[PDB]
Amino acid sequence: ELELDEQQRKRLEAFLTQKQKVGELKDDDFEKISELGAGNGGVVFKVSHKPSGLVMARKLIHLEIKPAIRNQIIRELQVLHECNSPYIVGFYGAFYSDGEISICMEHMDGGSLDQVLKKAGRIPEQILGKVSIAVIKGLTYLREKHKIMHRDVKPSNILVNSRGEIKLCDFGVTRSYMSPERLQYSVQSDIWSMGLSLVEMAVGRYPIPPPDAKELELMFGPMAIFELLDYIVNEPPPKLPSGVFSLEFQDFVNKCLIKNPAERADLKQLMVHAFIKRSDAEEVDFAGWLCSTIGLN
Amino acid sequence: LELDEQQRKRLEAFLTQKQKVGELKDDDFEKISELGAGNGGVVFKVSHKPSGLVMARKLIHLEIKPAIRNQIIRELQVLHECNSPYIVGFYGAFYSDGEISICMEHMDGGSLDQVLKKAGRIPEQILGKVSIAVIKGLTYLREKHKIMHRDVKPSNILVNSRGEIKLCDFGVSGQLIDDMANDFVGTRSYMSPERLQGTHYSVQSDIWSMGLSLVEMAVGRYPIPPPDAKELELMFGAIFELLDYIVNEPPPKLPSGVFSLEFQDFVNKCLIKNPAERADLKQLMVHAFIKRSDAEEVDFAGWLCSTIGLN
Ligand SMILES: Nc1ncnc2c1ncn2[C@@H]1O[C@H](COP(=O)(O)OP(=O)(O)NP(=O)(O)O)[C@@H](O)[C@H]1O
Ligand SMILES: Nc1ncnc2c1ncn2[C@@H]1O[C@H](COP(=O)(O)OP(=O)(O)NP(=O)(O)O)[C@@H](O)[C@H]1O
Ligand SMILES: [Mg+2]
C-alpha cells in the first residue's frame, strides 16, 4: 500500500514552505561549499543560496548546444516542481546561465548508494529491502501520477540521508535507412535497472559478467563498454548467489531481471511480492546502519 | 564462408604491412586528396612517410577531456581491429590536436553511393556480389559481437579495383554516445536488454538496410517515397513524412519484369516489416538469389573501373 504516512506529509509540507521561501534562482545567489561528486556530464556541488540561507545540491550540466533544444529542456524541466513525493529528491528549480544548465535540489547528507557501497563492501539484505520499496514507490509515483519514467535508475541515482530517507534523483530529461522496428524501453526497463542495482549492492560487485566460484569465495566463503553492452543483450541475466540470501529476495531480483520485458515483473506485481511484504513489515534502523557505514553521529 | 588460400594470404599480407607503420603520429601523414564525407568526419587519402603506405584517414573532430582519452582510444582500437576480408583493414587510431584519426586501407573504388552516381543504376549481377559480401560481412560481426555499432547503407560499402567489396569503419559517434550514457570508467551499464537492443544496430535491422540499399542502387533512386507508374516507365521501358511513410504505408519492392524473380524475392525477404519474420543471414546465405550470385562469374573490377574511370 502507498499513501502519505502522517510523519511523511509533515516533511513534504516542511519542504514546500522552505521552497516557497526561495522563488527565483540565478548564478550570483549561490556560493559553492564542497564537491559532492561527479559523473559523465554535470559535476555536483554542495552550495548555499544566500537569499534563503538554505543548503542545496547543484548539478551543473554542460550544454553549449542549440538554443531551441535548450529552452525546450528548461521548459519541460519545470514540471518537476509538481513532482513531490517522499521517494523523489526535493526539487527547487532549474535554470540556464553561463552556457550550463543547472539543477538545484535538496542536498542529501548520505550521498548516493554508489558511494555508500564503496564504504560498506556489501549492503545487507534488510537494508536493500528498504531500498527496493523506496524506488518501487518512486517509480509508481512518477508513473501513475506524472506518466514520467526515470530512464536512469542505478546506484548513483539512489540518494540517502541521515533521516533514513531514500530518494530518487536524475529524473531529468530524404535519406534514412533505419528499420521501421527501430524508427518507433518502459517502466519495465527501469525495473531491470533496479534488479541489477540490487544485485550489485548485494554482492558488492557489478554482476556482469558473473564470477566463477573462484572469485566468489573471496566474497562469501577486463572488457570494453561495447563487449559489455553486447553481453547484456545476448547472455543470460545475473542472479544473487544462493545460500547467502533469502529465497524471497533471490526470487524478487529474478522477476526484475527476466531478459524478456514482456514476461518480466511489473511495479504492481512487485509491490506485493513476498520479499516486499516482509520488507515493509520489518523495522530496520536504516539511519543507524547508514551513519555508521559512512561516519556521521 | 571460411576457405580461400588467397583470402588468407591477402589478410596475412595486410597484417604484415600493418605493423610497419609502427606508431602513428600527425606529422607522419601527407594529405594527398579528399575521398568523401559522412555524419562522422571527413576522409582524406594520405601518404604515410615512415612506410610509404597510402591510407584513408578519417578525422573525427570531437574534443575529449585528456583524462578519459587513452581509455576511449583503446576501446576504439579493440573495436576496430577486425580481421575479415569483408571489413576494410584497420591500421590504427590516435588523437592529435582535438581530433581522433582512424587510419584505414584505401579502397580505390570509393563507396557505393559514389559508384551509384557514376553508374545511374547498378546491374543485378553486380548487386548479387555486393549482396554476398555484405551478408558475409555482417555474419563475421555477429560472430564477434561488434554488430551493434554497424549500420548498412550505400555510403558504408566500399569497393576496389581488385574486385573486393567491404563494409567500412565504425561510426565512432555511437561508441562515444555509449561511453557517456553509461559508467565509462567502471565499465558498468544499467540499461535493459530491450533498451540496448533497440537503440543500437542489429543484424535484423541491418538486413532491412541492405534490402533498402539494394532497391536504391537497382532503380537509381532512394525508393521510400515509391516511384509511381510515370517514373517506372521513364527509367526502363518532406523530412518527417519519410519516417512516417516508412512505418505506415507498405515496403518498397523492385519493379517487375526488369529484375529476376530470385532478386525480387530476396529484397522482399529483407524488407518485411516484422524483424522476426524478415530473414536472417542463415536463410539469406542459402536463398536462390545468393546461390545464383555465388555461382556466376562476374567481372566486377572491370565494371567498376569502367564505371568510375581507373587506369
Ligand atoms: N542532491 C544530491 N545530494 C547529495 N549528493 C548528490 C546529489 N546529487 C548528486 N549527488 C552526488 O553526486 C554524484 C554525481 O551525480 P551525477 O552527476 O548525477 O552522476 P551520475 O549519477 O554518476 N550520472 P547521471 O547518469 O548523470 O546521474 C552522485 O554520486 C551523488 O552521490
Ligand atoms: N577506406 C576508405 N577508402 C576510400 N574511401 C573511403 C574510405 N572510408 C570512407 N571513405 C569515403 O568517405 C565517406 C566517409 O563516411 P563513412 O566512413 O561512412 O563515415 P562514418 O562516420 O563511418 N559513417 P556515416 O558518417 O554515417 O557516413 C564514405 O562514404 C566513402 O565515400
Ligand atoms: Mg546522478
Side-chain angles (χ1 to χ4, degrees), chain A residues 22-62 65 67-146 148-150 152-172 175-184 186-211 213 216-217 219-267 269-292:
Chain A
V22 186
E24 267 195 8
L25 333 88
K26 36 181 71 66
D27 189 294
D28 206 48
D29 291 349
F30 281 112
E31 231 82 74
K32 313 270 142 284
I33 302 150
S34 60
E35 191 157 3
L36 283 167
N40 301 144
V43 48
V44 187
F45 302 95
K46 198 186 167 153
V47 297
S48 46
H49 180 244
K50 324 138 72 180
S52 48
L54 285 161
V55 144
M56 320 198 311
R58 198 194 183 190
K59 190 171 219 217
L60 278 186
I61 300 152
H62 189 91
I65 288 297
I69 315 154
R70 144 213 158 183
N71 284 151
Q72 198 204 294
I73 287 158
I74 313 271
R75 271 159 207 173
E76 63 168 295
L77 270 169
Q78 304 310 145
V79 84
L80 276 55
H81 285 117
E82 295 144 26
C83 287
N84 273 61
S85 184
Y87 305 100
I88 301 293
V89 65
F91 185 62
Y92 282 126
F95 65 86
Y96 181 83
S97 147
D98 265 288
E100 280 194 319
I101 291 140
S102 55
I103 300 165
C104 293
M105 66 210 139
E106 159 192 19
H107 160 262
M108 297 273 267
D109 66 351
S112 71
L113 288 184
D114 187 38
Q115 304 173 297
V116 181
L117 187 65
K118 261 149 121 193
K119 284 230 163 294
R122 296 210 260 289
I123 306 191
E125 195 170 313
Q126 302 203 318
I127 296 294
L128 296 178
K130 288 271 178 295
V131 181
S132 307
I133 294 156
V135 348
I136 289 178
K137 289 197 194 173
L139 286 183
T140 304
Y141 162 95
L142 290 190
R143 193 182 71 169
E144 73 72 24
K145 206 176 155 289
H146 284 72
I148 288 168
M149 42 208 183
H150 201 257
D152 196 22
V153 159
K154 61 200 166 182
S156 56
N157 288 334
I158 307 178
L159 299 163
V160 293
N161 67 23
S162 52
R163 281 112 81 71
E165 30 197 41
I166 311 162
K167 291 156 174 197
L168 301 183
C169 68
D170 291 301
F171 29 36
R175 256 162 179 96
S176 184
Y177 299 84
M178 278 190 185
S179 199
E181 46 109 348
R182 155 78 158 282
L183 277 170
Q184 71 200 17
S186 172
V187 92
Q188 292 298 107
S189 173
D190 293 345
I191 292 194
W192 163 282
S193 282
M194 181 178 69
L196 176 82
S197 295
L198 259 31
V199 179
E200 204 185 349
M201 293 180 294
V203 310
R205 218 189 69 111
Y206 176 77
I208 302 174
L216 263 156
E217 255 61 309
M219 294 180 182
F220 303 99
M223 67 180 48
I225 232 110
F226 87 83
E227 321 205 60
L228 179 54
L229 278 205
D230 199 273
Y231 200 109
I232 292 152
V233 176
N234 287 328
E235 306 285 74
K239 44 178 198 267
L240 296 175
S242 59
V244 205
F245 309 93
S246 71
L247 297 161
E248 306 84 299
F249 186 41
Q250 299 216 227
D251 192 63
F252 185 97
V253 283
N254 288 351
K255 282 215 225 320
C256 292
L257 286 187
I258 272 139
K259 288 265 293 218
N260 164 28
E263 184 207 345
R264 181 191 303 148
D266 60 54
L267 289 185
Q269 295 202 305
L270 294 174
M271 186 79 216
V272 313
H273 191 290
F275 167 76
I276 289 289
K277 192 189 151 193
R278 190 249 279 167
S279 282
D280 210 319
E282 295 160 328
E283 259 209 327
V284 172
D285 175 48
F286 176 83
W289 180 91
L290 174 69
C291 299
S292 320

Side-chain angles (χ1 to χ4, degrees), chain B residues 4 6-8 11-24 26-62 64 66-73 75-229 234-238 242-243 245-311:
Chain B
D4 233 280
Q6 198 192 359
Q7 277 180 326
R8 218 158 297 221
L11 281 167
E12 222 277 89
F14 177 79
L15 220 151
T16 80
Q17 286 302 100
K18 211 271 179 59
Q19 45 65 236
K20 291 316 287 167
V21 76
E23 280 182 330
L24 322 93
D26 208 299
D27 191 62
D28 295 322
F29 291 97
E30 201 205 339
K31 185 158 294 186
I32 293 157
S33 47
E34 200 210 329
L35 282 165
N39 305 24
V42 197
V43 185
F44 299 92
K45 178 159 62 170
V46 286
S47 213
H48 165 74
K49 333 293 272 171
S51 209
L53 284 147
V54 44
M55 282 185 220
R57 173 176 160 177
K58 166 147 131 247
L59 289 158
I60 288 98
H61 196 82
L62 182 39
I64 307 154
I68 77 266
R69 276 223 301 265
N70 290 55
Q71 200 179 318
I72 91 106
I73 301 283
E75 170 126 9
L76 198 152
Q77 261 154 23
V78 167
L79 175 66
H80 289 251
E81 313 274 351
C82 309
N83 179 264
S84 184
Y86 306 98
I87 278 78
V88 62
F90 177 69
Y91 278 126
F94 58 82
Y95 186 109
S96 187
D97 180 55
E99 275 162 58
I100 319 172
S101 308
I102 311 161
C103 297
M104 313 157 265
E105 159 183 22
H106 170 235
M107 288 285 287
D108 68 351
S111 52
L112 293 175
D113 64 331
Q114 287 165 344
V115 171
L116 186 49
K117 284 184 230 293
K118 270 172 276 141
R121 287 198 295 260
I122 287 166
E124 193 165 329
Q125 314 205 313
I126 300 293
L127 294 189
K129 289 263 173 328
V130 172
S131 279
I132 288 163
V134 169
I135 270 149
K136 252 100 108 53
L138 302 166
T139 328
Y140 165 102
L141 299 179
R142 210 198 229 158
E143 252 76 19
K144 289 302 158 91
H145 308 110
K146 307 212 196 162
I147 205 63
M148 303 194 86
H149 283 336
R150 157 65 38 239
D151 67 329
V152 174
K153 49 203 209 318
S155 70
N156 302 142
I157 302 145
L158 298 174
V159 289
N160 61 16
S161 63
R162 61 212 228 275
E164 288 167 310
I165 315 167
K166 296 168 187 198
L167 298 166
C168 58
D169 225 14
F170 303 84
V172 163
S173 109
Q175 173 203 327
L176 312 194
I177 294 177
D178 281 343
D179 293 343
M180 283 336 98
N182 305 286
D183 169 14
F184 179 64
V185 315
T187 311
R188 29 213 258 287
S189 180
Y190 300 90
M191 282 175 210
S192 81
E194 325 101 66
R195 167 142 147 208
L196 284 184
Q197 182 58 306
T199 63
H200 296 70
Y201 312 108
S202 59
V203 313
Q204 297 298 129
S205 62
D206 286 10
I207 281 148
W208 165 286
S209 290
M210 194 193 46
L212 185 71
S213 305
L214 293 157
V215 172
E216 171 164 349
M217 261 139 86
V219 311
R221 209 196 74 171
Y222 188 82
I224 261 301
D228 46 297
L234 172 288
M235 306 159 179
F236 323 84
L242 206 76
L243 298 55
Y245 200 102
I246 288 176
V247 186
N248 294 127
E249 297 291 316
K253 46 159 182 45
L254 300 166
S256 246
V258 299
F259 299 99
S260 83
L261 306 166
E262 288 94 323
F263 195 31
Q264 270 171 270
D265 202 57
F266 182 80
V267 311
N268 289 7
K269 262 48 173 167
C270 295
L271 293 182
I272 306 140
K273 279 182 163 74
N274 182 322
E277 207 38 62
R278 138 158 26 116
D280 66 282
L281 327 165
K282 308 260 89 72
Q283 302 185 57
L284 298 178
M285 200 53 187
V286 301
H287 185 285
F289 182 78
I290 308 274
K291 285 182 322 291
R292 199 194 76 204
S293 293
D294 197 24
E296 278 148 25
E297 298 214 73
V298 178
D299 193 345
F300 176 100
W303 174 94
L304 173 75
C305 288
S306 307
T307 299
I308 71 170
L310 289 186
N311 299 26

